[PDB]
Swiss-Prot record:
Biological process terms in GO annotation: oxygen transport
Annotated tissue distribution: Hemolymph.
Family statement drawn from the similarity comment of this UniProt entry: Belongs to the tyrosinase family. Hemocyanin subfamily.
Disulfide bonds: C510-C548, C512-C555
GO CC term, one of those recorded: extracellular region
InterPro entries to which the protein is assigned, alphabetical: Di-copper_centre_dom_sf (IPR008922), Hemocyanin/hexamerin (IPR013788), Hemocyanin/hexamerin_mid_dom (IPR000896), Hemocyanin_C (IPR005203), Hemocyanin_C_sf (IPR037020), Hemocyanin_N (IPR005204), Hemocyanin_N_sf (IPR036697), Ig_E-set (IPR014756)
Residues the record lists as binding Cu cation 2: H304, H308, H344
Organism the protein comes from: Limulus polyphemus
Protein name (database record): Hemocyanin II
Amino acid sequence: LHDKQIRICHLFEQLSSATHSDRLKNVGKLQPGAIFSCFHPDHLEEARHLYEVFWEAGDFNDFIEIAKEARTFVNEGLFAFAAEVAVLHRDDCKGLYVPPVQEIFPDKFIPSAAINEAFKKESPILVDVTGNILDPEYRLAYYREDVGINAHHWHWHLVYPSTWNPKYFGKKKDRKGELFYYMHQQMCARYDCERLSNGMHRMLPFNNFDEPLAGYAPHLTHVASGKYYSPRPDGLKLRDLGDIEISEMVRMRERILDSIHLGYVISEDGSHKTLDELHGTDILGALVESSYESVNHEYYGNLHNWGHVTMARIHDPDGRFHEEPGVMSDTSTSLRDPIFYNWHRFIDNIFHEYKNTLKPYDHDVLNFPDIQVQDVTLHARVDNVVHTFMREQELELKHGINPGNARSIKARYYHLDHEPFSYAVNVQNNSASDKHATVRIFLAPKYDELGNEIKADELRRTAIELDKFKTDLHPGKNTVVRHSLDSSVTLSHQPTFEDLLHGVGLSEYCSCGWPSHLLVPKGNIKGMEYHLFVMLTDWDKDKVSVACVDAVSYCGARDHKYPDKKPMGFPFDRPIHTEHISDFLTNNMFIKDIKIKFHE
Ligand SMILES: [Cl-]
Ligand SMILES: [Cu+2]
Ligand SMILES: [Cu+2]
Ligand code: NA
């Protein structure tokens, strides 16, 4: 298995320099050096043909053999995509990690400037990553450009591929459309908490497709070709591509909004399928993204993914300038671009429209009889205050760019981080028996950037999930203690290439999950006030040998149903009809006011 791990690391090494068999016939279309789009139908189709070949490779040795052959001529982004899907899903690869994508393609995570200087200069090279900041959105560069959030977004879309065919794999990805919704909703809620942390208004939806887009220059090179991700200047409008017209996207949106308000979608055979309470968000995520499991691809289209494609190609809509797409084409770079967030707030508003047709939860669904949460305290250096700060890290570039005779080229970057903290929850169990509880913890900003109080129904768009875990409760008083390091949304550990080649990449071998260091928002130098919300629910009603649950909340569980029956984002997914969230609270719910205080 360590021998297996070594041989997988080798498939991913110097993959920008990597570049036939009847199996490999339908693959080799996209040219090496070109940027691979994780969203355009034709790049994804070639990517599926390749991971199909990898999937039906007779045995491990056969998978490595055919892969090694494919990587000599297929596009290298496509290969890393198809190869990560094979390693995640082949039974004979269980227990193996894939190398970190930021070490496979360092040039997607570090500015051209640091790469050029590292390619400019046998001792270790270190490149530390000046100029007027004239863009106010640069205040959130620490967030959008974080190495770990971009790597998480790459990995999530490969655990939950839009081309997944359950009939082919024999396996269903449980509630994949609903987790498409929730995970992108949580990225929006977390981004808006960073915007309010830095004194900015919450982001507006891109819901009018004639509005000019604001610009973003990525400053990322593609060493494989010397091509770069194309910058987008301020002031261009979406234009028709050869494959898709903007007015066709407007049709897809209208037809989806139509069905939400009628309460049923139309399948391919023309029958009506009701958006029930139980499956409606999943059905909607599949036809919105869209995925293979869309009930009617011809009618509802492919709106979210064509959004990425038209936005990534806006500088060269018909290809006449022969310019590569921008960072919105690729899941490992798209969060860098501000417009990612405006597009996903639009897409989140479609799901929000559907959640608004559902009746608010009543007290019977919210209450857990006999459990009463009596107090929550957050324990940190100062109780009920978390401190955030910037910290330095380095990334090894030698496995992905050509090191020559240097032993190591590292680039140093900085990233937000937070002191460790823990929760103590006091719970009175008034029954004469042991209860089992899921503890659900969320964080929500108290005020907006102009000091107004955010009302209960709007905290649905900004409540971020911090944890979900089972505890047992004995009759009487209980204190539940939980540590931040154990959060069910965060990746606890990514072994580097060097780790996996030696045995220091050491079950929990998947790479999806939120970065530990971005568990909580930045806050600000004064101390920004947040509602800390804790709810306990009856685990015998929630509950649905599991690998890859380190980040269960956002990533689900390997080969396993999503282990919580409640709607994703419960209790905050349905309209709350009460103005102040403190009037929402039931006895098994509690809010403690905390502050988050950034240190400059
Ligand atoms: Cl694209
Ligand atoms: Cu995404
Ligand atoms: Cu998107
Ligand atoms: Na975790």
